[PDB]
Amino acid sequence: HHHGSMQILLANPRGFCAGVDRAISIVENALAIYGAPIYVRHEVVHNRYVVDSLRERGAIFIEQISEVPDGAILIFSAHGVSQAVRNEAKSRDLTVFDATCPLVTKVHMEVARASRRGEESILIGHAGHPDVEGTMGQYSNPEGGMYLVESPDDVWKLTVKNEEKLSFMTQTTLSVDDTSDVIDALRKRFPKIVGPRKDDICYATTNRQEAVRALAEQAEVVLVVGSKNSSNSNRLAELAQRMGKRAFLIDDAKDIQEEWVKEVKCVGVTAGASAPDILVQNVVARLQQLGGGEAIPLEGREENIVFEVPKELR
Numbered sequence: 001h002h003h004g005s006m007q008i009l010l011a012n013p014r015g016f017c018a019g020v021d022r023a024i025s026i027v028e029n030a031l032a033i034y035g036a037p038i039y040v041r042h043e044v045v046h047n048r049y050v051v052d053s054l055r056e057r058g059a060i061f062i063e064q065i066s067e068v069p070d071g072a073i074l075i076f077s078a079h080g081v082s083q084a085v086r087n088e089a090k091s092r093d094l095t096v097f098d099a100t101c102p103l104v105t106k107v108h109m110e111v112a113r114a115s116r117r118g119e120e121s122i123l124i125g126h127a128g129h130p131d132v133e134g135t136m137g138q139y140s141n142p143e144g145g146m147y148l149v150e151s152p153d154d155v156w157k158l159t160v161k162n163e164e165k166l167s168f169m170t171q172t173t174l175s176v177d178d179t180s181d182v183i184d185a186l187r188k189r190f191p192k193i194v195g196p197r198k199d200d201i202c203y204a205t206t207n208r209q210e211a212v213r214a215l216a217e218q219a220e221v222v223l224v225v226g227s228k229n230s231s232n233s234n235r236l237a238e239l240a241q242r243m244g245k246r247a248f249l250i251d252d253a254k255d256i257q258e259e260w261v262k263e264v265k266c267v268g269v270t271a272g273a274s275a276p277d278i279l280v281q282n283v284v285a286r287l288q289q290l291g292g293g294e295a296i297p298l299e300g301r302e303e304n305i306v307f308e309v310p311k312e313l314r
């Protein structure tokens with residue numbers, strides 16, 4: 001467990017955010033209260049261990065509301081659903097509980113409010129991601145418009161109907177440094193545009209990036225615990241890599257390759273927002289097998305935010 005060659009450092013904060021803790025408990029609590037099966041639309045969170053653990057408990061993960069039988073209980077995932085998907089669930093004989101992150105619902109509601117006013121909306125976000133369908137699918141007014149931008153270059157190439165009546169929003173897990181450049185480009189291009197002071201990047205995302213930066217100034221190699229389809233986890237690995245360090249996104253301790261830490265003197269470990277602590281604890285045990293000493297957590301920003309389950313799920 002505890003003395004050896006290679007130092008192990010743990011980023012702070014790392015691992016579960018308020019939204020993911022809430023989402024998991026909505027699924028656990030529905031299973032404990034109503035019994036298996038409970039249907040969840042898509043993975044509740046982008047972590048295969050969390051998804052497999054709930055499956056064991058009796059959660060059924062489906063792709064389409066059309067796979068859910070009448071009379072069932074269905075949960076929307078933490079990443080949110082479009083208005084279409086919600087109405088479709090409303091039209092069916094189903095009890096729905098919604099695990100959408102409150103901080104995502106926040107962004108959904110600003111897109112819906114723009115549609116109602118005929119204002120065009122720009123989302124900063126990555127194409128071909130689940131969170132994006134959800135958020136873009138809050139916009140329904142055909143007089144207006146809804147556009148996705150990924151880069152300052154996309155802002156420069158964008159053409160809009162009425163630059164005078166424009167709003168922007170952003171996904172919640174994006175790279176803070178890269179979103180800042182995009183928003184600077186938007187506000188210069190469109191100085192009357194309205195959006196939030198800074199972005200709609202959530203506190204967990206911002207904190208985990210700040211922590212991985214601090215981590216990555218000290219360690220040669222960075223391990224980010226999270227699944228390949230977790231965009232926040234991926235942003236953490238990428239930050240470290242962009243600081244010139246080898247950085248590995250790993251689902252669990254078994255993905256660790258001895259070469260990655262051969263002759264390494266400081267290895268840093270973090271966890272995306274959907275990765276449970278038992279995964280990190282297993283990584284640390286594996287790193288110790290490989291010569292690591294005691295894991296030292298870095299000092300870090302305190303997080304104190306909690307989102308409660310719906311009262312009917314306590």
Ligand SMILES: C/C(=C\COP(=O)(O)OP(=O)(O)O)CO
Binds near residue numbers: 046078080173272
């Ligand atoms: C629900 C949510 C984040 C929790 O982390 P996840 O890893 O589940 O999702 P993401 O990073 O969006 O791929 C906000 O999209």
Ligand code: F3S
Binds near residue numbers: 018020205
């Ligand atoms: S949007 Fe919500 S699910 Fe976590 S990564 Fe941010 S608090």
